[PDB]
Design a protein around this ligand. Sequence first.
Ligand SMILES: COc1ccccc1/C(=C\C(=O)C(=O)O)SC[C@H](NC(=O)CC[C@H](N)C(=O)O)C(=O)NCC(=O)O
Ligand SMILES: COc1ccccc1/C(=C\C(=O)C(=O)O)SC[C@H](NC(=O)CC[C@H](N)C(=O)O)C(=O)NCC(=O)O
Lengths: 203, 203
Amino acid sequence: MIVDFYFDFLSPFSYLANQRLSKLAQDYGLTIRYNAIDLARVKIAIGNVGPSNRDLKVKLDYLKVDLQRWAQLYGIPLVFPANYNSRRMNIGFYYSGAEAQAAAYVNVVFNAVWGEGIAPDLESLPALVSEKLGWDRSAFEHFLSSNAATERYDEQTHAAIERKVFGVPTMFLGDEMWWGNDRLFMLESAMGRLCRQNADLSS
Amino acid sequence: MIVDFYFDFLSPFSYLANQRLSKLAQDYGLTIRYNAIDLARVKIAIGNVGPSNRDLKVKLDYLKVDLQRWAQLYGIPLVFPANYNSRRMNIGFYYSGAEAQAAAYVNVVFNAVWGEGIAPDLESLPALVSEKLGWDRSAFEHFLSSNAATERYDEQTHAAIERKVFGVPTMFLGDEMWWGNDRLFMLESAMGRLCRQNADLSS
Ligand SMILES: COc1ccccc1/C(=C\C(=O)C(=O)O)SC[C@H](NC(=O)CC[C@H](N)C(=O)O)C(=O)NCC(=O)O
Ligand SMILES: COc1ccccc1/C(=C\C(=O)C(=O)O)SC[C@H](NC(=O)CC[C@H](N)C(=O)O)C(=O)NCC(=O)O
């Protein structure tokens, strides 16, 4: 079974969604197709140009509380980084190879930025992540500034916009799209219905 | 046990929250303190002046899907009215007396506007609601245009802003605030923890 997952490493709701999706992968063998995309571009595409919730202190104050409530439910830390400059690490997702290493990259980067609060534009973060993954630091860093890397990121952002993705985290199963860590329960219910049909427990 | 509930009849997520809160009231004896407030005013107060999700077609298209998913979970219809001009009916909440009649007003108006799709500024809706509640139509209609009615609505909107309410539906228990029908599960868990402490099942 396959779920398409759309995220931007600036998003703490995406950090939460990735944690829960990774557990489904490891606990149930769910297959995740990862897509790192530019939230800023998807928002401007659909006309969402007003002040971001990041810039509305009273709402951000509550969202910070919501985020801690979910981190406590999930048993994980959640620490705000000093900035939301996720472009380099989003692009770096496209260096990863097959599924294990794609998931490993997404997990290590989310845990660094939102689990530890490491700024996503820290100059040494590509090297730190390379060391963790067993990658060639110099080759990764060269990939990050290459034209082909930006093109792949732009290609995926555009495809997500064509698919009617307006935010992150966004998940698809079949023709159904959910937006939010707080809609993963509906994706899980749809997966169960498909598990039951396939097992002949349901028509 | 008391929950403060903040809603605007323009809000379909508030319609969903009111349905679930009313069931908690009727199934568990939860006490709800209802507050009809002006969403537009609370948004402008915290600086949320960008295009509304109402005006972003691609996001609204998804929100309409989310709304139907929840209406199906809850077993209720949800039908968009022709407009979101909820001021008169919000003000009319302040005609209601004690708890049963306050809940009855909120239920009947939400069911009319979002259960049946009746425009909230329909000129005959105050009379229709009066007939249902056993109220004097002429006295209600006079109340709706009175200065004292607007003042009470403005007073409650202002108090909600002072309380850091930025949207609807908003629920408080004690010092904890949740925003969204999709956070009622956390309010329900907090209520259960308090039920257990009070019963001496937990310290
Ligand atoms: C760094 O971003 C940030 C910090 C703290 C709180 C939220 C955010 C969001 C982004 C932001 O403010 C913008 O840059 O716009 S994360 C991206 C948004 N996701 C959600 O708000 C999911 C909310 C859920 N209810 C859930 O997951 O529980 C997002 O996609 N914004 C687009 C939109 O249309 O709102
Ligand atoms: C008529 O409003 C409407 C129609 C369809 C979909 C949403 C709405 C919302 C309001 C709107 O677009 C504005 O007028 O701004 S309902 C009010 C908002 N509530 C929510 O979006 C709750 C979302 C939850 N995840 C949930 O309940 O599941 C609202 O409070 N907006 C303020 C904000 O800061 O977003």
